[PDB]
Copies of this chain bind each other. A is one copy, B any other.
């Protein structure tokens, strides 16, 4: 077997080969249609059942904006209907999201500096032409964030300005600040209080972006006015670590203080004319730490559908205990300066009115927070019926229908004592498994459920058919049995369901076929409303079909000494020669919450894995233990042991490939990844120098004590209880183990990285220097220009130090 040697291109020639083949800037294309909403036309004479509204980019260099398409009552089943995108807004930055109120037809969105509104599909009817956006007028000096329509009165919006909540009336022009917690004309180290804003760790590590929730119902007052309510989180970041990059912000490093959090409630009195009478800020009747002992993080919150109770999903610091809590507005009382007056209000609140833990669970691995939580209309004063998803019972996420009894508590506030841990716990009347099996329901990154309350069905997405494809399923929540798959095999799907439960949209792709979006009509046979069938209705987005210049990889699997099937992707060298062994590049992520190996189109983001194969590299990707869509036990393998197990699985997979394929030259293996991938690239060269000639680490984690609480503690615990795993997991603390031979270690980092600070790369550099070890470095100090330089530099480095003829001579 002769070594294959990649063509040795000049710098200028690699630059040209890359620019000639370059297809997409920043590893993304036009954002496919998304955030769909179905509105019925309710027009017996007309040809259309529904209008769909959605966000999309019509082209590559376009803004994300609002479109609608018409859903015909009938189609020609001989042909394929392509829906035409009619713009909703009359435009001469982008819209990331929007709000809608069914009853009025009011849209509300942010677009750059402005909050705007328009009306369509309400009582005022359906436009045939683009609408002019109506700017909501403000006096606020700074940009307004996170606007939301009051579901009980669409003349009212809320929004954030300089970390306080304001409200504003789009009819009357009345604008009112509700919270006085932050001073814009002040320092960041002096003022670390914020209302209605999710803090860094909740945004980055729990994907909660909003910190305030309109109560969905008005309370009518005896005057003929009403009360609106906003539940909001209030945060004090004073004790939280501050870090600067070239300004600065509050980053809870692992084992340090998270913010100090609480629930507040703004109570807003409006008269018969829609003008504010008064605004009463309310606080909890006893402080947060008393009512919810042991709770670090407010993971999710909202209201029950009639607005009787607020709810929250609450996590302990170790993220191994989860509680769902009902929080009556009655637990809130005016913020009172007068201790005398204040004392009266506290006793004016009955002892019966205390928090209600309707659900609690624990695990020895970790809680994976998700967006599934559906509350049924209350049928009885002292019962709540809901659907929630959990891995805690079987180690795969499944749907459970639960009924919790709303008991009066043992604990009495009057007695002047403190509550016991189980004093607010609610008895569980009923806990039925809706789903079960060796596969998971999806509840993250847009995956959710739709509940049909008429037919007593729940639509959900899951791994049931294959851990490599997401599919849409329907099942009864009343007498769970048959789970019906609604999407077709040989694609991975990403769906949403009409609110009306009679249509679904799928965005779908596979290894060979770029992404498409199609609409499917849902029906039931006349005899059984419980049974669901689907028919193709129309295409929303066609793909351009297979790219002529992209060769997909093949999915492979292998049974592993660890007891699991591990999946991988193999990119065979183009124009493959017989009796020639070729240099190999392992591309890796390997960290929690991500899966690289599945049946999806890889030709956009991972196009350059194809470019590499095209130059003569074997490219390999493997999802090691710790990767997702394989259940909690598979995910849990590296708890406390991050960095210790991932390279075994990668090497196992590589030896699998090399015994099965003799074109793989194990003498010439490179590894490359970003972030956790950068981490595992370094660990690889450190631990398995015999396997890996070269490691290129992008934005690596090098010291877990420099990373945040929400992520690090979940997988590695508090550092005080895992000094040894933090040590063995931190590449920076083990610089001595890297090779004493140059051209083997390349570090790549942005200077202004907000997630994986440059601090990781500079502390590693500091320890590499102490240990007298060599390293190559590239810095991208700000754009498409940076990305081209990286790709150019990476190809040139692999050529010169792995693949080329000269590479072999250099040793």
Chain A positions near chain B (C-beta within 8 angstroms): 10-12, 15, 187, 244, 246, 740-742, 751, 762-763, 765-766, 769-770, 772, 774, 776-782, 785-786, 788-789, 792-793, 796, 800, 806, 809-810
Contacts and interface: CB of A to CB of B under 8 A. Distances in A.
A769 B742 contact: no
Sorted from nearest, which 3 A-B pairs have the closest CB atoms? A762-B781, A769-B789, A777-B777
A741 B806 contact: no
A48 to B, nearest CB: 51
17 contacts: A10-B740, A11-B741, A15-B772, A244-B246, A751-B762, A762-B779, A762-B781, A765-B779, A766-B781, A766-B782, A769-B785, A769-B786, A769-B789, A772-B788, A774-B796, A776-B776, A777-B779
B810 A806 contact: yes
A778 B777 contact: yes
How many copies of this chain does one complex carry? 2
B11 A740 contact: yes
Given A762-B781, A769-B780, 11 more contacts: A15-B740, A15-B772, A187-B187, A244-B246, A763-B781, A765-B781, A766-B781, A766-B782, A769-B786, A772-B789, A806-B810
A77 B501 CA distance: 115
A777 B776 CA distance: 7
A777 B781 CA distance: 13
Nearest to A780: B769
Q: Is the interface of A mostly helix, strand, loop or mixed?
A: helix
Contact of A792 (B770, B772, B776): B772
Contacts of A12: 740
Given A769-B786, A809-B809, A741 B779 contact: no
Interface centre among A769, A776, A796 (most CB of B within 10 A): A769
Nearest to A778: B777
A779 B747 CA distance: 12
A770 B782 CA distance: 10
B785 A11 contact: no
A806 B805 CA distance: 12
Nearest to A792: B772
A763 B751 CA distance: 12
Contacts of A796: 742, 774
A270 to B, nearest CB: 43
Contacts of A792: 772, 774
A800 B800 CA distance: 13
A770 B781 CA distance: 11
Contacts of A785: 769-770
Contacts of A789: 769, 772
A741 B806 CA distance: 15
Nearest to A11: B740
A15 B740 CA distance: 10
Given A779-B762, A786-B769, A11 B774 contact: yes
A772 B787 CA distance: 10
A782 B780 CA distance: 21
A246 B751 CA distance: 12
Nearest to A787: B769
Contacts of A778: 777
Nearest to A806: B810
Contacts of A741: 10-11
A774 B762 contact: no
Contacts of A244: 244, 246
A613 to B, nearest CB: 24
A403 to B, nearest CB: 57
A244 B245 CA distance: 10
A33 to B, nearest CB: 34
Contacts of A793: 774
A804 to B, nearest CB: 10
A268 B781 CA distance: 54
Contacts of A809: 806, 809
B742 A11 contact: yes
Interface centre among A187, A778, A786 (most CB of B within 10 A): A778
A30 B451 CA distance: 81
A789 B766 CA distance: 11
A811 to B, nearest CB: 10
Contacts of A781: 762-763, 765-766, 769
Contacts of A751: 762
Nearest to A18: B772
A11 B738 CA distance: 13
A286 to B, nearest CB: 38
A420 to B, nearest CB: 47
A568 to B, nearest CB: 32
A779 B775 CA distance: 10
Contacts of A742: 11, 796, 800
Nearest to A187: B187
A785 B767 CA distance: 10
A10 B779 CA distance: 27
Interface centre among A187, A766, A809 (most CB of B within 10 A): A766
Nearest to A189: B187
A10 B770 CA distance: 18
Nearest to A741: B11
A781 B11 CA distance: 29
A375 B15 CA distance: 68
Nearest to A800: B742
A787 to B, nearest CB: 10
A242 to B, nearest CB: 13
Contacts of A782: 766
Nearest to A790: B769
A765 B741 CA distance: 26
A757 to B, nearest CB: 11
Interface centre among A741, A751, A765 (most CB of B within 10 A): A765
A650 to B, nearest CB: 26
Interface centre among A10, A11, A740, A772 (most CB of B within 10 A): A772
A611 B707 CA distance: 43
Nearest to A775: B778
Contacts of A740: 10-12, 15
Contacts of A788: 772
A800 to B, nearest CB: 8
A19 to B, nearest CB: 9
Contacts of A810: 806
A198 to B, nearest CB: 28
Nearest to A743: B800
Nearest to A796: B742
Contacts of A766: 781-782
Contacts of A772: 15, 788-789, 792
A762 B769 CA distance: 21
Contacts of A10: 740-741
